[PDB]
């Protein structure tokens, strides 16, 4: 029903910067929540940053201040700018879309991961 | 991965429910829609199972109300606080009436301490200045001044509606926040194919007084909404060709266009009430392109 | 293949009254006979008793009215939900959607005149235990608040609201004269240590202190789903699991019998404490002598 | 969901009699109508007899008096006794079941036809 495409990952060393991009493909563009989560070695998934169609953003206390989420509703594309990346940020980063369908009970749709 | 096939419930018109009021469907109607804005906020769902507007799954909780009620002194009116996060990106609480008019019904209250029950004739005017469901409160005019207690669980069950045919206007949306705009609305609907019009699933609302306009047209049956929500089959095209078939003989009576956004169109000109067999049903056949010419039906 | 719809308890509708479901209950049923005629359907999609598919057209009444002079009462001759006649030759206990319990149902009687569009609505009640409650014969009686307003040869609808009742006692569908016919069979746990699983709602009350508990054997959505999918029962029991979608953890398991009722492994009355997002999930077909794990 | 098995075909000569039987198999026995239909070569399929669990029978006007339908609820079996057979009765006879399910809208359940000559 919904497809998600991630890009822009990689690995930097302390003091570096990166930018993640996620493009969504829906048959009809919906009002949704698009966000970035991350999973670390032997550690469960945790929130990085989420943004809504209206513009409401929620950041995780760990990345508050350094990371910035942005959205384009016309392209249904979300961006995550990560500045001052430090060794505590090495993980696999997933993009997520959540809309008003059945899949919402099970967490929505997910991307590949970087 | 591999696509899930698309389907429509095997149900006749009279076995399905109207998605804008908790009543059964009665007929199929077709007519030009350029003179008015068709923007219902109930019965709105895409073909792959994504609810829009104020549309939910329960067919009983349409035009219903629940909460606690405070008497407006000097009147037989009462103010209900709705049980609600205003932050959800929806136009109004799910199941809110999506037309302007005066809805009659029953207000029933229960007293927790002992189990006392109460019931009274109530009415709600959706076009009233005190109708603010998005803000969490609505107004009912009842027949009592002292019967309903404070902060007791109260339920409004709708029944019907109360110059001839000047009320209710079904194609005029209420102001969910008041008189001083609506948000997150489902898109308006219009046929973008020449010689095509909308096919409405039409019911007759119960009337309780005067000379009301009792026609209520919905774009999708509630059963279709529940089915689309369950199956969640992706739309392989912009429009899906449905054919009205007779199950006994197999004869096709007409075909229509089911758009992925959630409405139906037919090839006709003029107002017309479709004459169909009582056992007829809609059958999905294929996904057709944007240039598909419907075979017209008289 | 067989499956149940992915829906929470509070998202489904009671099949014996048009109201949302509220909780799950379980208890002994030896002190009463459980034989409801609404919300009955086999797993392969075969409606039993007086059960139909419309969730709004339960306990409703349609037809024409005749006035009982000197009273505020009226007598309605019944029409089918398609506005056709009720044909009592149909091998059903009563017209589909008929109330299947004894009690006083309050609601509204609405009438419309075809020629000019005059409409009227009035407070009405119907007593299912009354001598004049004979739906199988095509006639019911209504207690109204008027003696002048309702006309003849005019379509009239009765929409229910609540009660003012013996939930497990069936009415006399043809009156105090005959017995009821073509009833759906009564259900009971045939396995040791098992109880019935009721989908429980609270009926609205409009007067008095009525017992408002109403239990159904299948949610109306389950009835619609079974009727639509028409999946044949490959065993006597279908193993369902109540699952929390957030964690995936199984709360309990229950047995969906092919005739159309659910059983759990419990002893004593208990209102089940469940997560709000939980749903029933079909897993496999197992035999009748399958021992369920104890239910918390 | 429902299985039907027929028996009893063959050839007679005008004035003869025969008997067809049809046994049904359901996971739960329902209130239903069991019946026989027939289709002649190059002809439309037509009704010959029906009977319900309550006992209500319906016959086609051509076979009244000559044909007799019977039912057994405990065995869930329907029988058709055809007497005084006509050359105009040569056809494929199908057994049919109709219960209160969705399939009923498409003509109910069918068994494998039985040739009658």
CATH H-level superfamily title of the largest domain in chain B: Positive stranded ssRNA viruses
CATH topology of the largest domain in chain B: Nucleoplasmin-like/VP (viral coat and capsid proteins)
CATH topology of chain A: Immunoglobulin-like
Beta-strand segment tally of chain B: 14
From the alpha carbons, calculate the radius of gyration of chain A and give it in angstroms: 14 Å
Number of domains of chain B: 2
Largest interface: B-C, 48 and 44 residues
Q: Percent of residues of chain B in helical segments?
A: under 10%
CATH superfamily of chain A: Immunoglobulins
> Tally the helices of chain B: what do you get?
1
Structural class by SSE content of chain B: mainly beta
H/E topology pattern of chain B: EEEEEEEEEHEEEEE
Spatially, the strands of the biggest sheet of chain A line up as 5-4-3-8-9
Helix content class of chain A:
under 10%
Q: What form of chain A results from the Cα inertia axes?
A: globular
The fraction of residues in strands of chain A falls at over 45%
Class derived from helix and strand content of chain A: mainly beta
Q: Helix tally of chain A? A: 0
